[PDB]
Amino acid sequence: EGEVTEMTPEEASTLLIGLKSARGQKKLRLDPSIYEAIQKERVQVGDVIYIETNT
Amino acid sequence: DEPWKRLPPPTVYPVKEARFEKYIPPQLDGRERALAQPPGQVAIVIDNGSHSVRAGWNFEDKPRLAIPPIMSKYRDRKMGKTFSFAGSDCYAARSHIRNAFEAGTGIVSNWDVMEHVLDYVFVKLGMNEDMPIVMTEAVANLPYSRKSMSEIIFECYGAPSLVYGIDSLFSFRHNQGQTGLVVSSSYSATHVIPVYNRKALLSQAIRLNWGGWHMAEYMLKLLKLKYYTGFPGKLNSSQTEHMVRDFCYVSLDYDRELAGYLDWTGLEDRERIVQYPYTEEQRDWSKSLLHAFRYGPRPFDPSSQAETHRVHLNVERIRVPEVLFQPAAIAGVDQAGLVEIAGDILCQRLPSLPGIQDAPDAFLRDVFLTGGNTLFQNFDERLRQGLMALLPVGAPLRVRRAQDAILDAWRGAAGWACTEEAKAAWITREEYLEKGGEYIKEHDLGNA
Amino acid sequence: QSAQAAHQALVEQLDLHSIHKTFRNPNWRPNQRRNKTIKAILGESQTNIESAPSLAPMKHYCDVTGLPAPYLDPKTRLRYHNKEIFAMIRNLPQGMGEQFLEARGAHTV
Ligand SMILES: Nc1ncnc2c1ncn2[C@@H]1O[C@H](COP(=O)(O)OP(=O)(O)OP(=O)(O)O)[C@@H](O)[C@H]1O
Numbered sequence A: 001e002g003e004v005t006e007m008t009p010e011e012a013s014t015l016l017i018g019l020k021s022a023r024g025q026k027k028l029r030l031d032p033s034i035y036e037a038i039q040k041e042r043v044q045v046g047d048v049i050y051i052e053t054n055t
Numbered sequence B: 001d002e003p004w005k006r007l008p009p010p011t012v013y014p015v016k017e018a019r020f021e022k023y024i025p026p027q028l029d030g031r032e033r034a035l036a037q038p039p040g041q042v043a044i045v046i047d048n049g050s051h052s053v054r055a056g057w058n059f060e061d062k063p064r065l066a067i068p069p070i071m072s073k074y075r076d077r078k079m080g081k082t083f084s085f086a087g088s089d090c091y092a093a094r095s096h097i098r099n100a101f102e103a104g105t106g107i108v109s110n111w112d113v114m115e116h117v118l119d120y121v122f123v124k125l126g127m128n129e130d131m132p133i134v135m136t137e138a139v140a141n142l143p144y145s146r147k148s149m150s151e152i153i154f155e156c157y158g159a160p161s162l163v164y165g166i167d168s169l170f171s172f173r174h175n176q177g178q179t180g181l182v183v184s185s186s187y188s189a190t191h192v193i194p195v196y197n198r199k200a201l202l203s204q205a206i207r208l209n210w211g212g213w214h215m216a217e218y219m220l221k222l223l224k225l226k227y228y229t230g231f232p233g234k235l236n237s238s239q240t241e242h243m244v245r246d247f248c249y250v251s252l253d254y255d256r257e258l259a260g261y262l263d264w265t266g267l268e269d270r271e272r273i274v275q276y277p278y279t280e281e282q283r284d285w286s287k288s289l290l291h292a293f294r295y296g297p298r299p300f301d302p303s304s305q306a307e308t309h310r311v312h313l314n315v316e317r318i319r320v321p322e323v324l325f326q327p328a329a330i331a332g333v334d335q336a337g338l339v340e341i342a343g344d345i346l347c348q349r350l351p352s353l354p355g356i357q358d359a360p361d362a363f364l365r366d367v368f369l370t371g372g373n374t375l376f377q378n379f380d381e382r383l384r385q386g387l388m389a390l391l392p393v394g395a396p397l398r399v400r401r402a403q404d405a406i407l408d409a410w411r412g413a414a415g416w417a418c419t420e421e422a423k424a425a426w427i428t429r430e431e432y433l434e435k436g437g438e439y440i441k442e443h444d445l446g447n448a
Numbered sequence C: 001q002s003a004q005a006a007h008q009a010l011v012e013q014l015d016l017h018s019i020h021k022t023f024r025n026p027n028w029r030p031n032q033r034r035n036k037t038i039k040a041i042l043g044e045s046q047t048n049i050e051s052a053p054s055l056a057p058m059k060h061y062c063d064v065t066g067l068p069a070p071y072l073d074p075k076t077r078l079r080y081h082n083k084e085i086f087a088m089i090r091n092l093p094q095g096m097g098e099q100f101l102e103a104r105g106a107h108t109v
């Protein structure tokens, strides 16, 4: 759970997303499936999002 | 009635400002020791602080002299003789004053004032002429300014050698600095300098044009606005300097603290009050936010001379230091704030440099605070909390303070003064006569 | 009176003209034009270029009381916290509005 600090489409399929909390930031490699879930919701840089990694 | 009428009498502090103090004779004992100490291991060390020119002997642990960069010159025409002053001999009783520096700026500009200040320094050090001078510079000091100073040193005083180094970098060397991010907030400005293997990466240093001067000027602007209906004390920047020093602090969460700051509950604790001098022969004030802003929980009347002669700081306690963190919001300075500057360096610049190895991790492990304007409460904690959110989680951030924020830059130059690094960086008078005052030896603590 | 005499004795005791400065080169005299502003020096110099504006959106604070300001007055362009401060803003002494702006370096011109 964090503020979306970066959204970098890695392929032209994969996304890399950067997430930040008050206590640090993190990068995640996203499968195209979870990417399009993130993209079906209208997530943009500066949004706050909740992700469950395995579900 | 009761919520004010039950309160104790207000605690109020006398106003302070810079003033003359008992005479200091010229210390001939320094000249004696300087000639007794071994050859090639003695220098005069001058830190050109825009707040205080600090001068003394490299072989001593503290400056002999700490002097405002000001002069005064006037005639009491009934007495006929001219009088002339440079430093705290200017009573900051005419206060007919000029300053060596351009206002709020790190760079010397009134060279005649500077030359009178240097005359005062060499008198107080007991010069009886011939001694090496170590002198501090602004970051990226202007070539013309470097020339004009060195020209004074070599034409007017004929000194054997001069060396220029950055005061914040001397401070980073008095402490056991090796690699780190040097954050300086000074009188003139605020600089973030990345230092790698004791060498500053001045091409990657950044300056924020806010400092202890701008805080005193901004505090004055706000208090003039607070009491725009007129205030009987003569508000001056030299007073608001002491107000900023004594009463300001950095908020750990500014919006949360600010939005509740003028709630009448506990406002008597959030408020602090200073007394200017005086002499004496369903809609209510208690529901007015502007009464709280100006006069706090007590009732006010203009009959009370003392109560008319006091300013209430209140929101200015925290609004003034926040200009470093939010310059464009609070003071309209179109510059990124301190946390955004340090984050841009650590996260965007240093990992992009060739060959720098483990950026940020190398630099990130020692963010280091220098200069007097860093001395605010929670300043280090606020800077750490801000950077922590910008860094990869669990990264080994440490934010550390110099052992002294003001003298330690002089102590670093005094320790460095006669090392082989320094004497390799010295320019001799003949080298100046060859190369001219624009020339400088490239070294880790100096400008390009 | 002795207090004035003692004061003038201090004014004498401090005077940098009463002190003689043998280390000062008597021959060298400065160029009278040497004192120049930073603007002049930079103009005549035609790294000391060292920062840029933030891209983040800035927060809004009341120009009067510094508290957060939801509102911007369209008439005077002062930012204000609440109706109590709007009431004082709209009846300010005529020149005062430009001072609240100038405290944040804003101006009408
Ligand atoms: N305890 C303190 N808390 C806050 N501010 C302080 C404190 N002590 C001193 N200051 C302020 O720090 C400033 C002095 O900073 P410093 O002496 O490091 O600058 P400087 O060397 O004169 O400047 P520069 O290198 O820019 O020419 C003054 O504005 C002074 O009011």
Ligand SMILES: [Mg+2]
Residues within 6 Å of the ligand: B048, B049, B050, B167, B168, B186, B187, B371, B409
């Ligand atoms: Mg300094």
